[model samples]
Target: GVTLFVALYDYEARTEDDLSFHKGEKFQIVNNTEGDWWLAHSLTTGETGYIPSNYVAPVD
Candidate 1:
């Protein structure tokens, strides 16, 4: 099983390793051990990278 999350705002990647996503885009939480950055797999683009934890919220 996996936890799904939705982007709350549009986030532009600051680095090559960062994941850029648009508002309302959905993702699967890969790893969330970090407090600020989290690993996520984008369902919209089939890409995986780091994303800001504050930019997304758990899907309800």
Candidate 2:
């Protein structure tokens, strides 16, 4: 599918594998091979990793 958009609300990476984002920051949905998690890129920070798909939504 095509790339999507997301806005962060509240997230903190407990480990190096987790992706964290500031509240209200925008990100790009890169991949979602699995159902529960998704790969996203932070538009502000240029970091990429797996984020909880539930943590984001479709771009408005």
State each model's C-alpha RMSD to the native: 1.0, 2.0
How far in Å is the alpha carbon of 39 misplaced in model 1?
0.6
Per-prediction TM-score: 0.91, 0.78
Itemize residue pairs with steric clashes in candidate 1: none
Candidate 1: tens digits of C-alpha lDDT, residues 1-60: 667999999999999889989999999988898768998999999999999999999898
* Backbone clashes (count) for model 1: 0
Task: Report the CA-based lDDT of candidate 2 relative to the real structure.
Answer: 0.77
Q: Candidate 2: deviation at residue 11, Å?
A: 0.2
Off by over 4 Å in 2: 1-3
Which run of 10 residues does model 2 get worst, by summed lDDT? 1-10
Model 2, span 1-60: residue lDDT tens: 555666647788887766887767677777787677787888888999878877877777
